[PDB]
Design a protein around this ligand. Structure first.
Ligand SMILES: C[C@H](C#N)Nc1cc(-c2ccc3cc(C#N)cnn23)ncc1C(=O)NC[C@@H](F)C(C)(C)O
Length: 285
């Protein structure tokens, strides 16, 4: 199963949760709205330790939910949970460390990593689709699909992460998620697997363009507003293709944009299911 760690043990392996970046000898690897993720070594195993940090009971709900989803969903396109720590007021989750971080950070070439080739971007999108398919095949809604939550192993295999907001059409009183990726219905309170498909369409736009879904110092601020400029023929997808590539052919790029535009239908019932998205991505290559 999973290993129950004492909090002081994860304190030692993370060097007191050193907030300096791993790029300069620290332990901090990334940051989210619900915690900070640190690098460590547990018994020669490189690990990722997410220290959670919303009500306290709510954080325990997402802590318990992540464990329950990870206990049942094991797949090569999902991250793996090794253990956790629950003693005290601090909640921690221990995962197998991902040598290439998040897709978001690699699209931005954070810490000097080389730009991703289009060929590898295609394989990453396919792997992320296979991960979403496995979760949907087991009746789980991710509710926070974004490039920051798509991680990459040593061979750049795509692995979905962060299942604290996952659920098994329904409404809720507490709207959660990253607004730049969320479907219109999810911003209103609906919980449905079609919202995951819409968020994946934004990721495909991030993969094509290399631009993050939101950039405050950018015009347009939201990547979705750029798609609208392409629909109205005021721009084309070739004008926004990531220039940090040299192997991107227009046919495959337009094919991925077609999947993205289908995923990004405002009406959820017009969006394809993840199985159709999977097949369209396989036919793209
Ligand atoms: C941006 C992201 C964060 N946070 N980074 C990582 C995440 C994770 C990782 C593994 C499992 C899980 C589960 C959750 C959740 N729930 C979150 N993370 N997680 N393993 C590593 C890194 C990392 O930075 N590796 C170094 C690499 F990037 C580089 C280029 C050498 O610098």
């Amino acid at each position: 199963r999973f290993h129950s760690f004492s909090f002081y043990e994860l304190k030692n392996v993370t060097n007191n949760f050193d907030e300096r970046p791993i790029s300069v000898g620290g332990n901090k690897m990334g940051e989210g709205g619900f915690g900070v993720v640190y690098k460590g070594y547990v018994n020669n195993t490189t690990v990722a330790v997410k220290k959670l940090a919303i009500t306290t009971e709510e954080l325990k709900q997402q802590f318990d939910q992540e464990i329950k989803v990870m206990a049942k969903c094991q797949h090569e396109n999902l991250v793996e949970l090794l253990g956790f720590s629950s003693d005290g007021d601090d909640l921690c989750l221990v995962y197998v460390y991902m040598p290439n971080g998040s897709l978001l950070d690699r699209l931005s070439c954070l810490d000097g990593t080389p730009p991703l080739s289009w060929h590898m971007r295609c394989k990453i999108a396919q792997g992320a689709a296979n991960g979403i398919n496995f979760l949907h095949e087991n009746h789980h809604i991710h509710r926070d699909i974004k490039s920051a939550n798509i991680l990459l192993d040593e061979a750049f295999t795509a692995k979905i992460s962060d299942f604290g907001l996952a659920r098994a059409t329904v409404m809720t009183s507490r709207i959660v998620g990253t607004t730049a990726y969320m479907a219109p219905e999810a911003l209103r309170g609906e919980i449905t697997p079609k919202s995951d498909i819409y968020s994946f369409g934004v990721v495909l736009l991030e993969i094509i363009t290399g631009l993050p879904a939101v950039d405050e110092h950018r015009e347009p601020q939201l990547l979705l507003d750029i798609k609208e400029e392409i629909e109205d023929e005021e721009k084309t997808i070739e004008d926004y293709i990531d220039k940090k590539m040299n192997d991107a052919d227009s046919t495959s790029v337009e094919a991925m944009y077609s999947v993205a535009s289908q995923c990004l239908h405002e009406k959820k019932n017009k969006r394809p299911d993840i199985k159709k998205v999977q097949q369209l991505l396989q036919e793209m290559t």
